[PDB]
Amino acid sequence: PTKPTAFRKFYERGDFPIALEHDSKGNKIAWKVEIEKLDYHHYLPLFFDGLCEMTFPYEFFARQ
Amino acid sequence: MRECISVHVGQAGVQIGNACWELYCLEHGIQPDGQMPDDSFNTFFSETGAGKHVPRAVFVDLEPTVIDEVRTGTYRQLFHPEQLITGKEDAANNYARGHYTIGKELIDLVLDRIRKLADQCTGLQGFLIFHSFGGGTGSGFTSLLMERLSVDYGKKSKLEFSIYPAPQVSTAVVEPYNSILTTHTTLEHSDCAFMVDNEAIYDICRRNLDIERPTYTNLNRLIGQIVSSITASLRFDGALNVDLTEFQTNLVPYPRIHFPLATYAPVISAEKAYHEQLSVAEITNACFEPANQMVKCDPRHGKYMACCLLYRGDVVPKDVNAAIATIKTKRTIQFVDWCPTGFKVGINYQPPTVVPGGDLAKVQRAVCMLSNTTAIAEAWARLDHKFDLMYAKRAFVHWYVGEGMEEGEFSEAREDMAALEKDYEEVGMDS
Amino acid sequence: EIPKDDLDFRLAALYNHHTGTFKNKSEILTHQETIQNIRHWINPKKESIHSIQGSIVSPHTAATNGGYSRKNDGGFFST
Amino acid sequence: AVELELEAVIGFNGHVPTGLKCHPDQEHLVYPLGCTILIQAINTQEQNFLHGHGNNVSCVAISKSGLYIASGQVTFMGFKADIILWDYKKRELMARLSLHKGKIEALAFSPNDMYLVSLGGPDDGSVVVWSIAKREAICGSPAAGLNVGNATTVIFSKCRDEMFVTAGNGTIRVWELDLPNRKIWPTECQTGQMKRIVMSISMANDDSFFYLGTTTGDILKMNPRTKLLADTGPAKDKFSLGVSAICCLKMGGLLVGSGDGLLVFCKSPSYKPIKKIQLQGGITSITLRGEGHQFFVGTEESHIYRVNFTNFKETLITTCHFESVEDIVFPFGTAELFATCAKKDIRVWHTLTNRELLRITVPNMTCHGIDFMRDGKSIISAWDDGRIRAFAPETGRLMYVINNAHRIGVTAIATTSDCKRVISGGGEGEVRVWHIGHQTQKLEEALKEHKSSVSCIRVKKSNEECVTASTDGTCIIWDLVRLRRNQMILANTLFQCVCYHPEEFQIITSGTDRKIAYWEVFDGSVIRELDGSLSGAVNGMDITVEGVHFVTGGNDHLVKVWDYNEGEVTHVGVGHSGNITRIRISPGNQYIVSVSADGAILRWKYPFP
Amino acid sequence: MFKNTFQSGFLSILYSIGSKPLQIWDKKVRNGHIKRITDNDIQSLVLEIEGTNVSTTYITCPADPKKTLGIKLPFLVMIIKNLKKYFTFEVQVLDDKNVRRRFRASNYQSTTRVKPFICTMPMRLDDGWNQIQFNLSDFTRRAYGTNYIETLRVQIHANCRIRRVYFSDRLYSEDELPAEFKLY
Ligand SMILES: Nc1nc2c(ncn2[C@@H]2O[C@H](COP(=O)(O)OP(=O)(O)OP(=O)(O)O)[C@@H](O)[C@H]2O)c(=O)[nH]1
Numbered sequence A: 001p002t003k004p005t006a007f008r009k010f011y012e013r014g015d016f017p018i019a020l021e022h023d024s025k026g027n028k029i030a031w032k033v034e035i036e037k038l039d040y041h042h043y044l045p046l047f048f049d050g051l052c053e054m055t056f057p058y059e060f061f062a063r064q
Numbered sequence B: 001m002r003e004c005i006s007v008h009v010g011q012a013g014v015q016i017g018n019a020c021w022e023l024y025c026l027e028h029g030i031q032p033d034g035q036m037p038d039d040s041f042n043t044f045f046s047e048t049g050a051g052k053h054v055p056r057a058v059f060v061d062l063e064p065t066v067i068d069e070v071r072t073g074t075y076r077q078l079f080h081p082e083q084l085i086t087g088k089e090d091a092a093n094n095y096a097r098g099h100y101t102i103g104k105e106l107i108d109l110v111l112d113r114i115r116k117l118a119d120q121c122t123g124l125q126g127f128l129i130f131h132s133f134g135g136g137t138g139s140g141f142t143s144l145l146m147e148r149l150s151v152d153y154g155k156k157s158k159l160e161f162s163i164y165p166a167p168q169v170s171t172a173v174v175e176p177y178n179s180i181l182t183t184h185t186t187l188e189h190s191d192c193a194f195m196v197d198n199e200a201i202y203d204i205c206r207r208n209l210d211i212e213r214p215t216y217t218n219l220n221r222l223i224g225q226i227v228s229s230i231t232a233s234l235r236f237d238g239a240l241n242v243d244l245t246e247f248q249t250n251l252v253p254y255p256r257i258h259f260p261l262a263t264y265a266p267v268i269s270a271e272k273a274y275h276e277q278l279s280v281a282e283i284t285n286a287c288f289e290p291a292n293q294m295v296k297c298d299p300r301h302g303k304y305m306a307c308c309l310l311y312r313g314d315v316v317p318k319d320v321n322a323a324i325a326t327i328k329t330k331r332t333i334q335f336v337d338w339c340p341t342g343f344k345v346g347i348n349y350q351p352p353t354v355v356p357g358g359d360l361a362k363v364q365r366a367v368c369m370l371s372n373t374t375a376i377a378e379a380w381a382r383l384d385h386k387f388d389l390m391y392a393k394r395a396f397v398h399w400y401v402g403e404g405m406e407e408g409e410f411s412e413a414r415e416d417m418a419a420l421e422k423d424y425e426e427v428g429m430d431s
Numbered sequence C: 001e002i003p004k005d006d007l008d009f010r011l012a013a014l015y016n017h018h019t020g021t022f023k024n025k026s027e028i029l030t031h032q033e034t035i036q037n038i039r040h041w042i043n044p045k046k047e048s049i050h051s052i053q054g055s056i057v058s059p060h061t062a063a064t065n066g067g068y069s070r071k072n073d074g075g076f077f078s079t
Numbered sequence D: 001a002v003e004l005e006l007e008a009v010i011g012f013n014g015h016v017p018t019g020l021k022c023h024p025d026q027e028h029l030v031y032p033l034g035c036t037i038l039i040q041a042i043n044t045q046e047q048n049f050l051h052g053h054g055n056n057v058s059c060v061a062i063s064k065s066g067l068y069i070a071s072g073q074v075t076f077m078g079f080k081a082d083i084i085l086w087d088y089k090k091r092e093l094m095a096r097l098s099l100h101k102g103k104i105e106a107l108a109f110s111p112n113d114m115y116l117v118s119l120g121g122p123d124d125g126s127v128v129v130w131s132i133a134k135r136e137a138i139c140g141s142p143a144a145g146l147n148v149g150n151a152t153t154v155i156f157s158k159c160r161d162e163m164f165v166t167a168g169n170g171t172i173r174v175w176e177l178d179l180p181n182r183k184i185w186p187t188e189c190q191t192g193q194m195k196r197i198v199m200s201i202s203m204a205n206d207d208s209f210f211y212l213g214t215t216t217g218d219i220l221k222m223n224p225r226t227k228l229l230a231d232t233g234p235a236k237d238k239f240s241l242g243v244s245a246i247c248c249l250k251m252g253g254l255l256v257g258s259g260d261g262l263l264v265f266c267k268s269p270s271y272k273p274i275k276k277i278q279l280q281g282g283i284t285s286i287t288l289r290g291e292g293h294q295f296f297v298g299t300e301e302s303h304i305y306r307v308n309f310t311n312f313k314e315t316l317i318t319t320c321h322f323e324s325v326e327d328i329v330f331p332f333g334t335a336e337l338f339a340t341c342a343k344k345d346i347r348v349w350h351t352l353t354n355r356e357l358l359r360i361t362v363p364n365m366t367c368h369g370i371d372f373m374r375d376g377k378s379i380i381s382a383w384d385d386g387r388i389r390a391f392a393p394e395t396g397r398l399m400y401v402i403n404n405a406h407r408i409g410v411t412a413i414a415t416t417s418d419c420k421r422v423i424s425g426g427g428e429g430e431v432r433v434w435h436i437g438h439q440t441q442k443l444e445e446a447l448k449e450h451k452s453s454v455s456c457i458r459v460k461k462s463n464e465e466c467v468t469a470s471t472d473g474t475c476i477i478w479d480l481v482r483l484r485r486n487q488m489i490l491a492n493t494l495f496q497c498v499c500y501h502p503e504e505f506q507i508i509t510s511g512t513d514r515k516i517a518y519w520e521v522f523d524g525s526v527i528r529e530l531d532g533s534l535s536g537a538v539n540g541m542d543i544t545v546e547g548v549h550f551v552t553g554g555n556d557h558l559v560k561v562w563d564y565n566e567g568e569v570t571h572v573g574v575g576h577s578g579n580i581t582r583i584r585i586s587p588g589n590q591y592i593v594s595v596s597a598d599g600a601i602l603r604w605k606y607p608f609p
Numbered sequence E: 001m002f003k004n005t006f007q008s009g010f011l012s013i014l015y016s017i018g019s020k021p022l023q024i025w026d027k028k029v030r031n032g033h034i035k036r037i038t039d040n041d042i043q044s045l046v047l048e049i050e051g052t053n054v055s056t057t058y059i060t061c062p063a064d065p066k067k068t069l070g071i072k073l074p075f076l077v078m079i080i081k082n083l084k085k086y087f088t089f090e091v092q093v094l095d096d097k098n099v100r101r102r103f104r105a106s107n108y109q110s111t112t113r114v115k116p117f118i119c120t121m122p123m124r125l126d127d128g129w130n131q132i133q134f135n136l137s138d139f140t141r142r143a144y145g146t147n148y149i150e151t152l153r154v155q156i157h158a159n160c161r162i163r164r165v166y167f168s169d170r171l172y173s174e175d176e177l178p179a180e181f182k183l184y
């Protein structure tokens, strides 16, 4: 059985600068800020925590 | 999978939305509480984790009187607590207090909620917006939204339902202004703008049906079914289906020309219906009749450029073909020179759904004709003239320049609606 | 109920050791066993007579229609 | 035309001020119930009737001797109201005394019985003096000044020359009577700058001070001998919706009421509560059983109370519908439960001893329909909103509501015996057919023929069709199984009730033309045409389950026993004053029960098995 | 709770201009009093809480002790008038290692001390009305090696005068602050 993670809790707070960009071509993530200047110590351990989720709008943001 | 987010900006939007959402709740059996006592709901609703199909819509109106009614009524459970958004004061029939002042205060909450509603979608196929040109929210806040969604969902089509300034009958004295100033900032952002006045639908309620003293309620329910008919192919099964994108690519010619109309077909009352056959031929021809259109603009005073006969119910594909052939012959209905076909069709094998407590009857067939006529220039020229008359003696312009809006904007808007007029002329001319 | 003497002291002796001051070894424990037309329905929502959802009543009654108006074709109006 | 028997009466018109009264013999209550005034016995089911009056009575006035009882009715504006004297010992009309145009608000007798003050009319307000000896007028004057407004109250004193009126506009005026010159002489009482709106008067037993109950929640005590104020009411914690009843005791105390039911016994100087008990409904009458140990309080939501002074413990002795009651229906099998159905309320009652067991109130709303499903698991109701509410038989919870059922109200309703279908009428003239599932309440068909409005649904014994009386002169036998019609029964009357004769081959129809007529279910032809009541129209019928007797009531305020095969009449009446709306044979063929335009539930011992 | 709220650049939990400012707040008054009105320099209503005991009378932003408001905004700014008396206030935060942690600022404390469930620090008020900016994301980092998640409580003690207790996304200068958030 899975446990709710910090990737979920940081999402409805809105800390992630992401939105599910709906391409007709596919599902990409639109980034409101540059990926290069992101704090990698805050986001990589947090985006890896979202792998455990299987519901669509959260597992896609972890995968992509 | 194929979902569409519906946004209701302005008293109208909400009022018409309280009618459109009622119908959806019935077609896809979802009781007011939000419970279904298989996948058609996706297009409009979204299941939680306990049969709480919650609407995929956003209701926004600065003044908290129309959304508070929803919050304290039948569909208090259906709509998500935070999907209904309000402010404090109103735009007081002033574009400025919706696109420059109060609007700004609510644009970053309305937008954030659309994002959340779009991030849970798997195939956003369009953003339907229910606005009312006359008001300051249905012209100002809707401009902010369409001027924002464009810089956030460029590809995503943005269809737009709109109660248009009725020929003579009108409520506010500044409606002329709001409309012109809002087309300037919505013509370059919307994909196609479905237009419905109020004079016409009032008549259709008295004559075609039998309702003396028709109110907004009645009007909103017929507009509600036009939406059901357009979105039916995306949620029920059919023989020739038509998705949101397929509307624009077969209805919008020269980019700017994007102002289609809307006519239902079996708008008959109970007593009358029984005594009638309502065949594909009849309902089809009834749609082209210049007294069933819902935007008083004498179809005969112009040329159709791209009709879209979207049907629903028992419609044998053969009868359809025949029916449309007849229409092509009759010369009263004249098409242009650069549109040989101009007849995108569509059949959805789902009989019209009777709103328990409406005025329409149990017809087992219907057609929704979305036509791109070049007669809407007449209506556009009327509003254009009204502006001039008032702007000449800078009438209610002090109110507009106080909430943020240079007098220049008025001039650009006028010169841009003039371009719309010129364009429609250079689209009716022959080769 | 009690399996042994510790639970007899631990159970509902009604002796608060914070509050009980200068008791005796008898009042150290005081067990609880020692001590001892019309059905009215109100609808929650309270609406108004001027918020009825429906068609609006003609001031002329249906059988008469004293303000006798018709359509352009002269049809009836029902209701 | 043998009279049956009139056992038991539920009903009280609490909307009048100064209603429920107890004559000084201390053994019978007196209260108004329409254009009649009842005499209910204390400690005995015995009750009698004072007939007379054309329209609804607004006043009662009983004497200190008890020998004379007077009353006063409303009428259409421009027409003359009638003040009817009576004798309590023989209950018979002895005066008509018609002077006041419009209506009446208040009556009071002289201490020893020889004059009557009968101030009458928001249209023609003018105080008059009557004679109890000559049955004739004596004096007359306008009861209010031209600067001030209109007066609605009267009282006498301990000397028969004073007559005192208050107003809803402040006309506190102590008059004096001048027989030789045949005139009255007023004197406005100065009260400082306290202009108030007051609706109740009581005086002390030793003629000291008169007491007022204002709308502000303030007891005004003033002097009739110096024409001045003496003491204002509660300084802080004032009363609710204005004091609508005051009754000064033999002591220096006073039982002060309220528009909420806060009956308070307070003393003179502070007007501060001593013993408070909350009554349901706004207090409209505070009587005294003579000496004052058992004072009976009446309320506008008509509930007669019984309070002992020395403990202030109540006993609800009477409970009534305070508005017009329509549709009485019985549960299947048993005959000891009612469905008394009115504006703002739905009630059930025990037949043998009249006592309500459930009250179902949907705010300020009206229910023109009620029905009981065969399983006895839902009381189906038809409300004015357009929603078919189905309450539960016990508790009273709303099991389901059918939102937007009909446009202009749902008037007539009926369930089916299979407990799956509720046939619904409408004020727009539509017959809807709903399906009652375990979780859904859907629509199956919208059958629309009737133009005006539907009046009465009736369903047969084994469900295949239903008859729907309508206000446009049509009664259709709709085919319920195949969702169509079968008949086009037509007449020139506004139909108001239809019933299925057992062994269904013919239907009995009623209406406005009083032409009670058997109609066949095949070919829809006239069968008989009986004459109803010679006075008005017929609202309501019920045929017994043996098809030998159908009962009838109408605008003619009168229950009518009619056997079937021959059209002879076994008429009874002498019932209640108020338009009989519906009537229902008991399932056990043991009582017949009729409702009326004024809230009244009558039971008659049904003859003729 | 404040969880479904967007929590934008501004969020106010108490503002003295309104019908019931202390609606979500819980009032505990003991040998003191609470009032709402005095115009000394700004001609506006400012809430007063003061009493002879500073640690006993106070106001707490979540009324129910089980409920906690969740605000992700790192900067915590209140506008408090100096009264030259004892004033303290609380803030309780949730940490990334899931520890209920508290901070205290006081007028009557000489030196600061940090240890695991309470960090108490001194404070010097100005002469009159001032605003103070309690950077929660930095005080949860200097005091303990910890990141900020969300606050849970704020509590304001006696001998102070209160207007516009609010959170902010980041520190704002006086000019870019909007008109309804200004000191004057
Ligand atoms: N068809 C239809 N039109 C409506 C309805 N309600 C409002 N309208 C139209 O809305 C126009 C004016 O806009 P408003 O109703 O004031 O709504 P708004 O856009 O929020 O304007 P403000 O509240 O002043 O900012 C009127 O001219 C009406 O034609 C409705 O229920 N049905």
Ligand SMILES: [Mg+2]
Binding pocket: B010, B011, B063, B090
């Ligand atoms: Mg508005």
